[PDB]
């Protein structure tokens, strides 16, 4: 069975990703936390309220609320209410969050360099075409994926 | 995150496989049951004891014992002790098991025809090369997979 063969692989690869992240001290920056950190970092001119965060990650209000409170717990951001309207919550990347941001870019660079060692942009493009076609063949009517 | 993107896909594909199997009435023949049925079917000259079954699927004694008792429950096989030594258990495919065997070959034919529609042997070979390389890159020392 290739199903079970495939699941087991992704799980093992997730294991590797996680250890790699520990090693770079950019744990907890795997998924959505890292996305918000890199958003904040790259656009310091602009602000992000929690409402902006929901839209930027396409997540629900309660989920967003849990995320940012986790990020705050981690010390990556400060949550400061709009001085003009204290129902609006702004997120600001801390010193620690900016450190994590620069660490995260490094990590992502080395991770891809390691993972994609010995593999061409062509090979990848093929890979993507195959997966997407499979997905198409099997889903039929249900083809509403990523 | 491609991890979560990838897991979700395989899960959805498993969903499709399962419904396809129901439709062909070859449910429960997904994995190891189907392998033993097709082994029995293709080699009627030879016999398979439960001990042979363990070796043919590389599974433990207790696991094998559960499998074949499930297969018996399903009506796919008869479990009959060696007439000469009643500690040896032989498996025999029933009429229903032979029907399932011929159904299973059909199913597998149509499944691949559907899934691999619009995809070349080349594309596949590339796919396999990429996956295996990824696996190699990330596992390092731990490269002892399928
Ligand atoms: C936390 C995990 C990961 C994150 C956050 C992530 C994020 C990214 C980002 C932002 C890019 C865009 C690169 C660019 O052109 O600047 C990228 C590209 C890519 N990623 Fe990942 N990635 C992750 C894990 C993986 C994994 C596990 C794989 C495969 C196993 C993978 C394969 C790729 C490939 C093939 C590209 C395309 C390179 C290109 O077009 O230049 N990534 N990833
Ligand atoms: C219960 C599920 C499945 C079983 C039991 C199964 C079994 C098999 C077997 C026996 C073959 C050998 C074909 C031959 O040359 O005679 C095969 C080939 C193949 N299978 Fe599957 N398969 C399953 C599901 C899948 C899935 C889900 C995929 C991909 C999504 C897949 C992709 C392939 C490919 C690409 C080949 C190679 C064709 C060739 O070399 O001629 N299979 N499978």
UniProtKB/TrEMBL annotation, chains A, B:
Where heme b 2 is bound, by residue? 112, 121
Q: Which UniProt keywords apply?
A: DNA-binding, Heme, Iron, Metal-binding, Transcription, Transcription regulation
Any single GO BP term: response to stress
List the GO molecular function terms: DNA binding; DNA-binding transcription factor activity; metal ion binding
Q: Which residues form a coiled coil?
A: none
Residue positions binding heme b 1: 112, 121
Q: Which Pfam families match?
A: MarR_2
Kindly indicate whether the keyword Kinase belongs to this entry: no
Q: Which residues form the HTH marR-type domain?
A: 1-136
The record's annotation in InterPro entries points to: HTH_MarR-typ, MarR/SlyA-like, Tscrpt_reg_MarR-type_CS, WH-like_DNA-bd_sf, WH_DNA-bd_sf
SMART domains from the UniProt entry: HTH_MARR
Q: What is this protein called?
A: HTH marR-type domain-containing protein
């Amino acid at each position: 069975n290739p199903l079970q063969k495939a699941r087991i692989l992704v799980n093992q690869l997730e294991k590797y990703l996680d250890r790699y992240a520990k090693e770079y001290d950019v744990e907890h920056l795997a998924g959505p936390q890292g996305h918000l950190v890199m958003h904040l970092y790259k656009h310091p001119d602009k602000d992000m309220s929690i409402k902006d965060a929901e839209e930027i990650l396409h997540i629900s209000k309660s989920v967003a609320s849990n995320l940012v409170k986790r990020m705050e717990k981690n010390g990556f951001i400060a949550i400061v209410p709009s001085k003009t309207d204290k129902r609006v919550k702004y997120l600001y990347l801390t010193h620690l969050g900016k450190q994590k941001a620069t660490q995260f870019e490094i990590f992502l660079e080395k991770l891809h360099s390691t993972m994609l060692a010995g593999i061409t942009k062509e090979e990848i493009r093929t890979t993507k075409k195959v997966i997407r076609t499979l997905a198409k063949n099997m889903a039929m009517e249900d083809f509403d994926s990523l």
